[PDB]
Amino acid sequence: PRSCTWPLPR
Amino acid sequence: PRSCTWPLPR
Amino acid sequence: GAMGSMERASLIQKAKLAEQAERYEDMAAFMKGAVEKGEELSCEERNLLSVAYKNVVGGQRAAWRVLSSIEQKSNEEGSEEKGPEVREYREKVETELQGVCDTVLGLLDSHLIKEAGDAESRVFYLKMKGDYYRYLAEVATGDDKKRIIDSARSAYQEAMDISKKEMPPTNPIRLGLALNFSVFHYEIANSPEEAISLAKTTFDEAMADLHTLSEDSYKDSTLIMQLLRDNLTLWT
Amino acid sequence: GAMGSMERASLIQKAKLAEQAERYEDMAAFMKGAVEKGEELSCEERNLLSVAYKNVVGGQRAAWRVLSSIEQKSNEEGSEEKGPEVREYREKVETELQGVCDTVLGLLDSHLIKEAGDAESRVFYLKMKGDYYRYLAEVATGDDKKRIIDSARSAYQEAMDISKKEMPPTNPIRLGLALNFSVFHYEIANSPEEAISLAKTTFDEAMADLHTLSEDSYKDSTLIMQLLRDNLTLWT
Ligand SMILES: *SCCNC(=O)[C@H]1CCCN(C(=O)c2cc(Cl)c(O)c(Cl)c2)C1
Ligand SMILES: *SCCNC(=O)[C@H]1CCCN(C(=O)c2cc(Cl)c(O)c(Cl)c2)C1
Ligand SMILES: [Mg+2]
Ligand SMILES: [Mg+2]
Ligand SMILES: [Mg+2]
Ligand SMILES: [Mg+2]
């Protein structure tokens, strides 16, 4: 997976 | 559902 | 045009990269540049042109439908007055959509259709002409609506006449044409019985010709055949 | 600017319509117009600005990654020479991405950050500044790369210092800031241990403060907390 950042695009 | 047409967008 | 300085082959190469990157506006601009080089398009190149603009106009049509639905609800009894903004923004998206349709129709008229002598290429382009007049018809409301509708009908009908004469009933372009013309009848021409008749006849004639096909051709044809069945199930 | 003649309230109304229509380029242009009216942004308006540009740059970043991967493979031993087209098109997307980042950074510098006195708004904008320098850093390769990286670090650090002083550990902006700064450490600064330490400390301090929250606030906070856990699971 790619690392999560916030906010997430739709 | 919406009626199917071809080609379908990604 | 901004693509006038780029090699034809480079434009086709970049259209394929744009597809991989899901950059469909770029894809369409590259393929417009390729068409404007003035040479006929190969089978694969026609497919790139079609996929590019179908994805662009598909996003615009989806947005237009969202905005038109909001606008319709705003005009129901008991709905609070919200000002001109919904109509304005719907009109903005509509005008952009109409622009894309006009661009595609312009490429077909100058000069893809007239230079297309083989049945496969001519039918391909006439189907596109029907499709983009159909998208214009989805948003049309003025003095010209009936003529837009008849322009779609006329292009589809010419494509149908050629495809019946010159292509097997399982041909994927013939199948997609008949699928889309059947939706034209249902959604645009207020002719659901014609839509159902066309879908059924198209499906049955293709079924009867599948025995002639290779495995790979069978997959191409049955994929579109399933869309005919899906529509018949929605409509009956 | 092309939005200079439109009312601020109409721009915000249309940004919300564009979001509903998944028209994020339009959304961003409407919110840029709203910012350029010169008034501070409310909480909801900041969220619209953030969502709009995050979706625009998100598509560009995804496309850039596809194209960079193709370009890298083209430069491996045994790869056929294909000409300049992959690099050219990667550069085209890169330049467009850099333009969007520069536009957002320009709005923050003129004059969102300097007029933001409340901790929530100041932290929100400094987090955005860190994020868009981070997206510039993802594509940077020249003399300026280290300074781009330090600009991201510096904005994130100022946001962190304010948020620790002025906001609870469960605050969603504080949480998203720490999440993104931890990814900055892992992906950009080559500091995986700092990334893991920050994610873990942020998660644990938020856990300990959840008991103070309403049900609705608890949902907002735990949603981002799960992303911290997801990253820790990827990284350990
Ligand atoms: S171009 C090389 C061989 N491929 C094709 O001839 C067709 C074959 C069957 C599948 N195809 C379609 O179904 C099709 C694609 C597109 Cl982009 C259209 O606009 C339509 Cl109408 C049909 C490609
Ligand atoms: S603006 C009215 C009340 N809502 C909010 O204050 C926050 C509340 C918690 C959820 N939010 C976020 O998680 C969030 C949204 C966006 Cl667009 C960001 O860029 C970030 Cl960093 C966090 C909205
Ligand atoms: Mg109109
Ligand atoms: Mg008939
Ligand atoms: Mg560059
Ligand atoms: Mg620390």
Residue numbers in the entry:
A (entry chain B), B (entry chain B): 20 to 29
C (entry chain A), D (entry chain A): -670 to -666, 1 to 231
Please quote the authors directly.
14-3-3 is ubiquitously expressed in mammals and plays multiple roles within the cell, including phosphorylation protection, conformational changes, subcellular trafficking, and induction or disruption of other PPIs.13,27−29 14-3-3 typically binds to a phosphorylated serine/threonine in intrinsically disordered regions of its clients. Of the 7 isoforms found in mammalian cells, 14-3-3σ is the only one that harbors a cysteine residue proximal to the client binding groove, providing an additional degree of isoform specificity. The disulfide tethering screen targeted C38, a native cysteine on 14-3-3σ located proximal to the natural product binding pocket within the phosphopeptide recognition groove. We explored the scope of disulfide tethering for the discovery of selective PPI stabilizers (molecular glues) using the hub protein 14-3-3σ.
The binding affinity of compound 2 to 14-3-3σ was >10,000-fold better in the presence of the FOXO1 phosphopeptide than apo 14-3-3σ and all other phosphopeptide clients (DR50 = 360 nM vs >2 mM). Compounds 2, 3, and 4 showed the greatest fold-stabilization in the protein titrations decreasing 14-3-3σ/FOXO1 KD values 5-fold, 4-fold, and 12-fold. A cocrystal structure for FOXO1/2/14-3-3σ was obtained, with clear density for both 2 and the FOXO1 peptide. The phenyl ring of 2 stacked against the front of the FOXO1 peptide consisting of the +1 Trp and the +2 Pro residues. Strikingly, in the presence of 2, the Trp of FOXO1 underwent a conformational change to form a hydrogen bond with its NH and the amide carbonyl of 2. Moreover, the hydroxyl on the phenyl ring of 2 made a hydrogen bond with the S45 of 14-3-3σ, explaining the benefit of a hydrogen donor or, potentially, acceptor at that position. An overlay of 2 with the other peptides revealed that 2 could not reach the smaller +1 residues in the other client peptides or that the peptides sterically clashed, potentially explaining its selectivity for FOXO1 over the other peptides. By contrast, the +2 Pro of FOXO1 locked the conformation of the +1 Trp and thereby prevented such a π–π stacking interaction with 2, while the +2 Arg of Pin-1 allowed π–π stacking to take place. The stabilizers for FOXO1 had a highly conserved scaffold, consistent with the rigidity of this peptide.
